[PDB]
Design a protein around this ligand. Structure first.
Ligand code: HEM
Length: 154
């Protein structure tokens, strides 16, 4: 698939707001993911033991990882579809080391869209949400193709 420049502008316009607070957004997103789909928490051996949202909010480690996660995603969105190089090491570690099924990348895509919608209503109307969804679907499709080449397709 291919996004138009107008769709990329709607995606990078709301992403510029997310970047004003990367650690806060990283925390909200991971907590929304773990609450909504608790089975995903099991994949993080580092966080597995967190029982409540209050423990999640207070974990400095969790917040550090949320910044690592969003910084990598941001670098991929800013490529505007030319992300082949960025996608390689990410597809290799998530398929071979972490073992993250495509379904879980769909679940965190849902969490990203929920959080931007709650925090940035003015910059995340229907058209901006359709463009962000297209951008994350492109990301998932390309990662899924690489997972296949790597021998995982999960
Ligand atoms: C927007 C999607 C995602 C991005 C851009 C992302 C990015 C990253 C990055 C940059 C790292 C550190 C380097 C590496 O190991 O590759 C990482 C580590 C990891 N990711 Fe992801 N990730 C994504 C989705 C997920 C999802 C959905 C899960 C699990 C349900 C997951 C599980 C993990 C685990 C277990 C690690 C290692 C954490 C720790 O022990 O250090 N990732 N991810």
């Amino acid at each position: 698939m291919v996004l138009s420049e107008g769709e990329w502008q709607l995606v990078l316009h709301v992403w510029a707001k997310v970047e004003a607070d990367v650690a806060g957004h990283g925390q909200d997103i991971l907590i929304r993911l773990f609450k909504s789909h608790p089975e995903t928490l099991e994949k993080f051996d580092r966080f597995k033991h967190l029982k409540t949202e209050a423990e999640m909010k207070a974990s400095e480690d969790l917040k550090k990882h949320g910044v690592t996660l969003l910084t990598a995603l941001g670098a991929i969105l800013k490529k505007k579809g030319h992300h082949e190089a960025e996608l390689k090491p990410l597809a290799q570690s998530h398929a071979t080391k972490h073992k993250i099924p495509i379904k879980y990348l769909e679940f965190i895509s849902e969490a990203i869209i929920h959080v931007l919608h709650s925090r940035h209503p003015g910059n995340f109307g229907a058209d901006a949400q359709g463009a962000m969804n297209k951008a994350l679907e492109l990301f998932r499709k390309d990662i899924a193709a690489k997972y296949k080449e790597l021998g995982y397709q999960g």
